[PDB]
Design a protein around this ligand. Sequence first.
Ligand code: CLA
Ligand code: CLA
Ligand SMILES: CC(/C=C/C=C(C)/C=C/[C@@]12O[C@]1(C)C[C@@H](O)CC2(C)C)=C\C=C\C=C(C)\C=C\C=C(C)\C=C\[C@@]12O[C@]1(C)C[C@@H](O)CC2(C)C
Ligand SMILES: CC(/C=C/C=C(C)/C=C/[C@@]12O[C@]1(C)C[C@@H](O)CC2(C)C)=C\C=C\C=C(C)\C=C\C=C(C)\C=C\[C@@]12O[C@]1(C)C[C@@H](O)CC2(C)C
Ligand SMILES: CC1=C(/C=C/C(C)=C/C=C/C(C)=C\C=C\C=C(C)\C=C\C=C(C)\C=C\C2=C(C)CCCC2(C)C)C(C)(C)CCC1
Lengths: 154, 42, 208, 198
Amino acid sequence: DIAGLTPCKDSKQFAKREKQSIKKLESSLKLYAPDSAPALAINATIEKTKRRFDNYGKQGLLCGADGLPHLIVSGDQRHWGEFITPGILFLYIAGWIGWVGRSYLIAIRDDKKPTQKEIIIDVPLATGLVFRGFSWPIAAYRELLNGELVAKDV
Amino acid sequence: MRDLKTYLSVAPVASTLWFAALAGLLIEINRFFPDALTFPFF
Amino acid sequence: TVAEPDRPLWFPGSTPPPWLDGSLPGDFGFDPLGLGSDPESLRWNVQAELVHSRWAMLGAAGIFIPEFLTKLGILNTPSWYTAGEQEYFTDTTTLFIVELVFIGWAEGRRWADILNPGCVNTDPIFPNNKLTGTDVGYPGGLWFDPLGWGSASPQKLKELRTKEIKNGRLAMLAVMGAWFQHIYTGTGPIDNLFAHLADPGHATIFAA
Amino acid sequence: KKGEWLPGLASPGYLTGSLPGDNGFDPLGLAEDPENLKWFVQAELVNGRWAMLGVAGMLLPEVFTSIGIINVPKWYDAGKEEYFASSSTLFVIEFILFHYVEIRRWQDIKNPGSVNQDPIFKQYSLPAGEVGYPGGIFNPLNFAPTLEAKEKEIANGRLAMLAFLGFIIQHNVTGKGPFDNLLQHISDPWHNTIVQTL
Ligand code: CLA
Ligand code: CLA
Ligand SMILES: CC(/C=C/C=C(C)/C=C/[C@@]12O[C@]1(C)C[C@@H](O)CC2(C)C)=C\C=C\C=C(C)\C=C\C=C(C)\C=C\[C@@]12O[C@]1(C)C[C@@H](O)CC2(C)C
Ligand SMILES: CC(/C=C/C=C(C)/C=C/[C@@]12O[C@]1(C)C[C@@H](O)CC2(C)C)=C\C=C\C=C(C)\C=C\C=C(C)\C=C\[C@@]12O[C@]1(C)C[C@@H](O)CC2(C)C
Ligand SMILES: CC1=C(/C=C/C(C)=C/C=C/C(C)=C\C=C\C=C(C)\C=C\C=C(C)\C=C\C2=C(C)CCCC2(C)C)C(C)(C)CCC1
């Protein structure tokens, strides 16, 4: 397939890893009781392992000769769940944080003692500003067209 | 009491609270949707 | 606004705090942590204490009447604690959603009036209708005061209101006791009362 | 009183009750700039008119075919039924025509009155209305473009945008038509919610 990687459903190495880890867990299990709390913890971990391997099977990830999952970030459309849509999520959240921070900085810059509001936050003001990040993209766009994002004469 | 409200907004306390809440949020997310490598929705 | 200077004091001999003058109803000068030393703080917490007291009174009625007449074979309402699950015509999440919408409307109205007095008074659909009470937390009007019982002039209104706040404090404490008894024991409250009454010198909390 | 979206909350200084539909709602400070507001008014009107056409053409065919007059598909299916032409052909035609009309609208937003007159026949211009409201030939019935009817317009447009939101989230979570959805909630409602859907 892409870069020679075959699917984790069809990968024998992927399966081998799954069953090796599972029965290593279950060899560590055969102790303490068949019902004591340690046994219950170990069985929960076994079930979580099965869920993890099966989910990676469902999601159509690519495996190599190692038997572990690989990531395709080229832009191919069968793999946007790997990098590009979590990347869009990240860029949105990051811009949110930074936009709120810059608007707070601007809001307090005209105070007589601006440093007093830097080391001691004005929490009601920030509470009014937190939710503008929700539309930070549109605002930042109309602030770029306005000639309003970049400090003139710097 | 007002002095306490001010003190609670001093930088170390504010950051402590902010990050403890953030930590609880990420911890609970990962306790519900464990072992995520991709965005499996759309 | 009648600064009773030598009212009853919860701790006799104390000198009450400067912000607790005697104007507010149900005043006894109890704020040893100084949680009400700022006027806006004080008025907000007045609203909070009031609404908590009315909620607690509704709840105390809804437990202690139905339980006292469930022990007696009047009704067959299950345990107030275990009544959270015994299922009705629907499930609970939808029941909660409709309750949410309905009561959240009213709480937003009360919100508006707490932050801007008398600015939501009348109805938009029917402007002629108007709430008749001129204080925050004492709405009046026909809906909340159709009997006229409430609106009057001081020495009359002040006493009625103090009576309200004392009943409410006792009801908050009452439902708190119901909760902690039924979590400590696995019983009903009327059972607790009857057992303790049949052996007061021995049927206390010190039975475990 | 020019209407409050929140009977306790005060107006913003930048909203004047001048444009129709003003109820004083802009909590996120999007239009605290007059140029921003001039642009946003236009976007709201045009998005609303498209939502109106879309939701009407989505929903009315459903009930028409559901009490047996004509047989039409569902909106989330109608793009697949084969037509007299490719969907590529129709898309390219659409692109060129919308190119033309959208750049015309653009120039009129930028410079009112400058794109009025016909470019082929040097007569047959348009009278000098306002931006967002081109009357004239686009108004054959010569209805009075009065203040009362602009508030009518924008209210219908807002409700249409919300109807569109509903249709798409509905289809993606349930999987059938909005009339299916409606009546199957209608008869037995207290077990027909978004909750049991989730
Ligand atoms: C290092 C060179 C390079 C580069 C730069 C690219 C770039 C790209 N490739 Mg490609 N590729 C490469 C090498 C490269 N490739 C190689 C070597 C191969 C052979 C394996 C491929 C094989 C390949 C395939 C098979 C495909 C691509 C595709 C793509 C495109 C996918 C991303 C996209 O669709 O846009 C981005 C997606 C979006 C939804 C855009 C949203 C982003 C927002 C707008 C930005 C967020 C900013 C912020 C949050 C908000 C803005 C605020 C602002 C106002 C201030 C992209 C432009 C795909 C394609 O053709 O695209 C359709 C595709 O199918 N590539
Ligand atoms: C949520 C309940 C609540 C609230 C909001 C108030 C609020 C108020 N009380 Mg009140 N009080 C209460 C419960 C409450 N009380 C109960 C149950 C009793 C009976 C024991 C009393 C008895 C009492 C007296 C005698 C007096 C007041 C007074 C006052 C006012 C003084 C200002 C102040 O205290 O700062 C603000 C208040 C708060 C910030 C609420 C504090 C909540 C803390 C954090 C609870 C801590 C936990 C608790 C100690 C243990 C709970 C477990 C337990 C139930 C088993 C104020 C408006 C004075 C007054 O003049 O009234 C007008 C006064 O003299 N109260
Ligand atoms: C105890 C309490 C508050 C106590 C607060 C105290 C002591 C604070 C005191 C001080 O701070 C001050 C003032 C001043 C400081 O300087 C000093 C200290 C000392 C710090 C509130 C309870 C408040 C209790 C309330 C509000 C109860 C409401 C109950 C309801 C509505 C019941 C609902 C039900 O419906 C369910 C859900 C299920 C149904 O089946 C049945 C029922 C049970 C009926
Ligand atoms: C364009 C649109 C819909 C158009 C649909 C069309 C044409 C449908 C077309 C078709 O059906 C046909 C005809 C035939 C079918 O075979 C094919 C399709 C293709 C299906 C909807 C827009 C819909 C747009 C929506 C929902 C907009 C939402 C905006 C919101 C919520 C903003 C709120 C606030 O901004 C304020 C006002 C103030 C701020 O301060 C705070 C916040 C809260 C941010
Ligand atoms: C697509 C893709 C890709 C590629 C990429 C690239 C290569 C690109 C780029 C890029 C670039 C080349 C960029 C740029 C930039 C520039 C500039 C110039 C900048 C800027 C920025 C800013 C200005 C910011 C601002 C802000 C905001 C808005 C937020 C907050 C605040 C602040 C202020 C920070 C890859 C393959 C990898 C992957 C797949 C997909």
